[PDB]
mmCIF file of C-alpha atoms (C1' of nucleotides) in Angstrom:
data_model
loop_
_atom_site.group_PDB
_atom_site.id
_atom_site.type_symbol
_atom_site.label_atom_id
_atom_site.label_comp_id
_atom_site.label_asym_id
_atom_site.label_seq_id
_atom_site.Cartn_x
_atom_site.Cartn_y
_atom_site.Cartn_z
ATOM 1 C CA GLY A 1 -48.828 -3.795 -23.386
ATOM 2 C CA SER A 2 -52.097 -2.210 -22.287
ATOM 3 C CA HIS A 3 -51.748 1.479 -21.430
ATOM 4 C CA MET A 4 -47.945 1.507 -21.468
ATOM 5 C CA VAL A 5 -44.757 -0.015 -20.055
ATOM 6 C CA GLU A 6 -42.377 2.680 -18.813
ATOM 7 C CA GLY A 7 -43.509 6.154 -17.804
ATOM 8 C CA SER A 8 -42.539 9.274 -15.870
ATOM 9 C CA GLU A 9 -43.162 9.570 -12.130
ATOM 10 C CA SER A 10 -42.487 12.947 -10.515
ATOM 11 C CA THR A 11 -44.232 15.906 -8.880
ATOM 12 C CA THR A 12 -45.497 17.284 -12.191
ATOM 13 C CA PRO A 13 -45.201 16.392 -15.913
ATOM 14 C CA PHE A 14 -44.494 19.996 -16.916
ATOM 15 C CA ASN A 15 -41.017 19.411 -18.343
ATOM 16 C CA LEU A 16 -38.602 21.304 -20.588
ATOM 17 C CA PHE A 17 -35.254 20.512 -22.211
ATOM 18 C CA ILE A 18 -32.460 23.046 -22.706
ATOM 19 C CA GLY A 19 -30.255 22.670 -25.765
ATOM 20 C CA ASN A 20 -27.468 24.748 -27.294
ATOM 21 C CA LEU A 21 -25.807 25.635 -23.990
ATOM 22 C CA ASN A 22 -22.458 26.154 -25.719
ATOM 23 C CA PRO A 23 -19.831 23.742 -24.306
ATOM 24 C CA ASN A 24 -17.280 26.548 -24.014
ATOM 25 C CA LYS A 25 -16.982 27.580 -20.365
ATOM 26 C CA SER A 26 -18.244 24.440 -18.628
ATOM 27 C CA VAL A 27 -21.509 22.551 -19.121
ATOM 28 C CA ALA A 28 -21.830 21.849 -15.397
ATOM 29 C CA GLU A 29 -21.754 25.616 -14.905
ATOM 30 C CA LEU A 30 -24.090 26.309 -17.819
ATOM 31 C CA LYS A 31 -26.722 24.002 -16.339
ATOM 32 C CA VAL A 32 -26.288 25.596 -12.920
ATOM 33 C CA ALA A 33 -26.509 29.114 -14.326
ATOM 34 C CA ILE A 34 -29.956 28.209 -15.618
ATOM 35 C CA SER A 35 -30.587 26.662 -12.209
ATOM 36 C CA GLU A 36 -29.718 29.543 -9.889
ATOM 37 C CA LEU A 37 -31.811 31.528 -12.362
ATOM 38 C CA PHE A 38 -34.895 29.353 -11.907
ATOM 39 C CA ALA A 39 -34.323 29.985 -8.205
ATOM 40 C CA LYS A 40 -34.052 33.777 -8.351
ATOM 41 C CA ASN A 41 -36.829 33.761 -10.956
ATOM 42 C CA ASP A 42 -39.393 33.489 -8.167
ATOM 43 C CA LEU A 43 -40.139 29.762 -8.265
ATOM 44 C CA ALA A 44 -38.920 26.274 -7.378
ATOM 45 C CA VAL A 45 -37.464 24.437 -10.373
ATOM 46 C CA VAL A 46 -39.187 21.062 -10.046
ATOM 47 C CA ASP A 47 -36.592 18.973 -11.879
ATOM 48 C CA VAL A 48 -32.974 19.783 -12.722
ATOM 49 C CA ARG A 49 -30.691 17.183 -14.300
ATOM 50 C CA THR A 50 -28.032 17.022 -17.015
ATOM 51 C CA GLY A 51 -27.524 14.761 -20.007
ATOM 52 C CA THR A 52 -24.181 13.518 -21.318
ATOM 53 C CA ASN A 53 -21.061 15.553 -20.510
ATOM 54 C CA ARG A 54 -22.057 17.899 -23.350
ATOM 55 C CA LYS A 55 -25.543 16.980 -24.572
ATOM 56 C CA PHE A 56 -28.248 19.035 -22.852
ATOM 57 C CA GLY A 57 -30.023 19.735 -19.572
ATOM 58 C CA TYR A 58 -33.567 18.772 -18.595
ATOM 59 C CA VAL A 59 -35.874 20.473 -16.095
ATOM 60 C CA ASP A 60 -39.437 20.257 -14.782
ATOM 61 C CA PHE A 61 -41.688 23.192 -13.891
ATOM 62 C CA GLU A 62 -43.938 23.497 -10.844
ATOM 63 C CA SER A 63 -46.915 24.010 -13.157
ATOM 64 C CA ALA A 64 -48.592 26.326 -15.664
ATOM 65 C CA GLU A 65 -48.100 28.909 -12.916
ATOM 66 C CA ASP A 66 -44.324 28.837 -12.464
ATOM 67 C CA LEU A 67 -44.049 27.889 -16.137
ATOM 68 C CA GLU A 68 -46.014 30.918 -17.332
ATOM 69 C CA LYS A 69 -43.881 33.309 -15.283
ATOM 70 C CA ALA A 70 -40.713 31.751 -16.694
ATOM 71 C CA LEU A 71 -41.678 31.965 -20.366
ATOM 72 C CA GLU A 72 -42.604 35.579 -19.626
ATOM 73 C CA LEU A 73 -39.104 36.236 -18.294
ATOM 74 C CA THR A 74 -37.099 35.101 -21.319
ATOM 75 C CA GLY A 75 -33.665 36.138 -20.090
ATOM 76 C CA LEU A 76 -32.358 32.664 -19.293
ATOM 77 C CA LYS A 77 -29.397 32.128 -21.654
ATOM 78 C CA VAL A 78 -26.290 30.350 -20.366
ATOM 79 C CA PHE A 79 -24.269 33.571 -20.468
ATOM 80 C CA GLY A 80 -24.509 35.133 -23.913
ATOM 81 C CA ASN A 81 -25.878 32.802 -26.578
ATOM 82 C CA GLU A 82 -29.574 31.918 -26.400
ATOM 83 C CA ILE A 83 -30.848 28.362 -25.947
ATOM 84 C CA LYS A 84 -33.705 26.131 -27.098
ATOM 85 C CA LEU A 85 -36.670 25.350 -24.845
ATOM 86 C CA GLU A 86 -38.634 22.191 -25.645
ATOM 87 C CA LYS A 87 -39.208 18.675 -24.316
ATOM 88 C CA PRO A 88 -39.398 16.088 -27.129
ATOM 89 C CA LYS A 89 -37.882 13.234 -25.117
ATOM 90 C CA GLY A 90 -40.755 11.324 -23.541
ATOM 91 C CA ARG A 91 -38.450 8.333 -23.136
ATOM 92 C CA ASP A 92 -34.848 7.235 -22.589
ATOM 93 C CA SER A 93 -32.561 5.900 -25.318
ATOM 94 C CA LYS A 94 -29.267 6.448 -23.494
ATOM 95 C CA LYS A 95 -27.998 4.869 -20.272
ATOM 96 C CA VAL A 96 -30.406 2.065 -21.164
ATOM 97 C CA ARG A 97 -28.266 0.061 -23.589
ATOM 98 C CA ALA A 98 -31.496 -0.151 -25.588
ATOM 99 C CA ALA A 99 -33.210 -2.563 -23.195
ATOM 100 C CA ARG A 100 -34.213 -5.574 -25.296
ATOM 101 C CA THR A 101 -32.049 -4.787 -28.315
ATOM 102 C CA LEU A 102 -29.535 -6.458 -30.617
ATOM 103 C CA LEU A 103 -26.448 -4.918 -32.199
ATOM 104 C CA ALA A 104 -24.902 -6.436 -35.333
ATOM 105 C CA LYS A 105 -21.138 -6.269 -35.846
ATOM 106 C CA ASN A 106 -19.025 -7.016 -38.922
ATOM 107 C CA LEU A 107 -20.614 -5.343 -41.948
ATOM 108 C CA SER A 108 -19.956 -5.403 -45.694
ATOM 109 C CA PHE A 109 -19.559 -1.620 -45.741
ATOM 110 C CA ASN A 110 -22.538 -1.687 -48.105
ATOM 111 C CA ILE A 111 -25.342 -3.439 -46.225
ATOM 112 C CA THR A 112 -28.885 -2.164 -45.718
ATOM 113 C CA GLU A 113 -32.313 -3.369 -44.552
ATOM 114 C CA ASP A 114 -32.577 -5.955 -47.322
ATOM 115 C CA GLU A 115 -29.796 -8.207 -46.046
ATOM 116 C CA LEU A 116 -30.445 -7.025 -42.492
ATOM 117 C CA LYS A 117 -34.166 -7.710 -42.154
ATOM 118 C CA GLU A 118 -33.330 -10.647 -44.412
ATOM 119 C CA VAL A 119 -31.235 -12.375 -41.745
ATOM 120 C CA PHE A 120 -33.407 -11.219 -38.844
ATOM 121 C CA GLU A 121 -37.207 -11.020 -38.651
ATOM 122 C CA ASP A 122 -38.414 -9.870 -35.231
ATOM 123 C CA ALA A 123 -36.312 -6.725 -35.634
ATOM 124 C CA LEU A 124 -38.553 -3.737 -34.928
ATOM 125 C CA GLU A 125 -35.735 -1.201 -35.228
ATOM 126 C CA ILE A 126 -33.382 -1.778 -38.161
ATOM 127 C CA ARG A 127 -30.430 0.611 -38.366
ATOM 128 C CA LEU A 128 -26.974 0.329 -39.934
ATOM 129 C CA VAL A 129 -23.827 2.291 -39.098
ATOM 130 C CA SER A 130 -21.456 2.470 -42.067
ATOM 131 C CA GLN A 131 -21.681 4.997 -44.904
ATOM 132 C CA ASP A 132 -18.824 7.304 -45.896
ATOM 133 C CA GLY A 133 -17.938 10.080 -43.461
ATOM 134 C CA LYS A 134 -15.567 7.723 -41.661
ATOM 135 C CA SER A 135 -16.759 4.160 -42.253
ATOM 136 C CA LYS A 136 -17.435 1.826 -39.329
ATOM 137 C CA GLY A 137 -18.678 -1.504 -40.649
ATOM 138 C CA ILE A 138 -21.165 -2.035 -37.827
ATOM 139 C CA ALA A 139 -24.966 -2.240 -37.787
ATOM 140 C CA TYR A 140 -27.394 -1.923 -34.867
ATOM 141 C CA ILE A 141 -30.905 -3.291 -34.306
ATOM 142 C CA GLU A 142 -33.629 -3.246 -31.643
ATOM 143 C CA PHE A 143 -36.177 -5.908 -30.673
ATOM 144 C CA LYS A 144 -39.687 -5.477 -29.277
ATOM 145 C CA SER A 145 -38.403 -7.650 -26.425
ATOM 146 C CA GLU A 146 -35.502 -9.755 -25.156
ATOM 147 C CA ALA A 147 -37.319 -13.045 -25.735
ATOM 148 C CA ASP A 148 -37.308 -12.577 -29.506
ATOM 149 C CA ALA A 149 -33.901 -10.927 -29.165
ATOM 150 C CA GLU A 150 -32.115 -13.926 -27.654
ATOM 151 C CA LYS A 151 -33.922 -16.361 -29.950
ATOM 152 C CA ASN A 152 -33.238 -14.547 -33.223
ATOM 153 C CA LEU A 153 -29.814 -13.499 -31.940
ATOM 154 C CA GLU A 154 -28.351 -16.911 -31.113
ATOM 155 C CA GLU A 155 -30.096 -17.979 -34.319
ATOM 156 C CA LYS A 156 -28.803 -15.565 -36.961
ATOM 157 C CA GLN A 157 -25.677 -15.319 -34.804
ATOM 158 C CA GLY A 158 -24.262 -17.606 -37.468
ATOM 159 C CA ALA A 159 -25.179 -16.183 -40.863
ATOM 160 C CA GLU A 160 -23.318 -14.804 -43.887
ATOM 161 C CA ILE A 161 -23.878 -11.165 -44.840
ATOM 162 C CA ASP A 162 -20.288 -10.366 -45.818
ATOM 163 C CA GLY A 163 -18.635 -13.755 -46.216
ATOM 164 C CA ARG A 164 -17.734 -13.368 -42.548
ATOM 165 C CA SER A 165 -20.986 -14.487 -40.927
ATOM 166 C CA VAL A 166 -22.074 -11.080 -39.601
ATOM 167 C CA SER A 167 -21.880 -10.538 -35.845
ATOM 168 C CA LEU A 168 -24.880 -9.914 -33.607
ATOM 169 C CA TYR A 169 -24.786 -9.440 -29.842
ATOM 170 C CA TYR A 170 -27.394 -8.314 -27.325
ATOM 171 C CA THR A 171 -27.640 -4.852 -25.782
ATOM 172 C CA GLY A 172 -29.656 -3.389 -22.924
ATOM 173 C CA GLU A 173 -30.991 -5.380 -19.981
ATOM 174 C CA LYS A 174 -34.614 -4.868 -18.941
ATOM 175 C CA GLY A 175 -35.478 -1.480 -17.473
ATOM 176 C "C1'" G B 1 7.964 1.182 -9.997
ATOM 177 C "C1'" G B 2 4.526 2.672 -14.943
ATOM 178 C "C1'" A B 3 -0.340 3.262 -17.636
ATOM 179 C "C1'" U B 4 -4.302 2.914 -20.614
ATOM 180 C "C1'" G B 5 -8.410 0.813 -23.652
ATOM 181 C "C1'" C B 6 -13.203 0.624 -24.146
ATOM 182 C "C1'" C B 7 -19.205 0.998 -24.111
ATOM 183 C "C1'" U B 8 -21.708 2.008 -32.422
ATOM 184 C "C1'" C B 9 -26.895 2.527 -34.121
ATOM 185 C "C1'" C B 10 -30.069 5.489 -31.373
ATOM 186 C "C1'" C B 11 -32.134 13.362 -26.793
ATOM 187 C "C1'" G B 12 -31.800 11.800 -19.068
ATOM 188 C "C1'" A B 13 -25.256 8.993 -20.106
ATOM 189 C "C1'" G B 14 -22.370 7.805 -16.399
ATOM 190 C "C1'" U B 15 -23.350 3.811 -8.101
ATOM 191 C "C1'" G B 16 -18.358 2.059 -14.787
ATOM 192 C "C1'" C B 17 -14.740 -2.040 -15.357
ATOM 193 C "C1'" A B 18 -9.985 -4.997 -16.892
ATOM 194 C "C1'" U B 19 -5.408 -6.174 -17.838
ATOM 195 C "C1'" C B 20 -0.650 -5.439 -19.342
ATOM 196 C "C1'" C B 21 4.644 -3.646 -19.049
#
RNA sequence: GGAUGCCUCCCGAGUGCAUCC
């Protein structure tokens, strides 16, 4: 994995995420509002995309130039409530079914990493979903790759974490 | 003649599908 695997490829890295748009009027509109703004703000919004019906909106800046001017002209705001400007992403966890991952179904409503990592081994990302606040009885895990995923998967596929031989399917694809 | 269910964990998530009554 020299250097890296997946990376960004656009006009310029200068990016920025917009959170807290307030899903009241209409996200689509909220994102646009910020758009038209970037247009009448004397510049050319490099990137402009949305994320999940009501998650957030991403955007790229022409460069320190257009970026500087923007920051200087706070204003922005969807309509009334302010928003958050920052780009912590750097990757993609959604719309990627966790490429090279493995989800575990059927839980004991009291499992953790002990029994989890216990059944698995090549699991780089161990996470369980089931703890009060509306139980679920389902755990999720990620693998450094599909190779180890399929192997371990089909392997532990038949275990016994809750007297029901916990479930474990694959999730993702490749890229 | 009728209609809906689902994709968990996880900051870009929507070229999204199936069957039943």
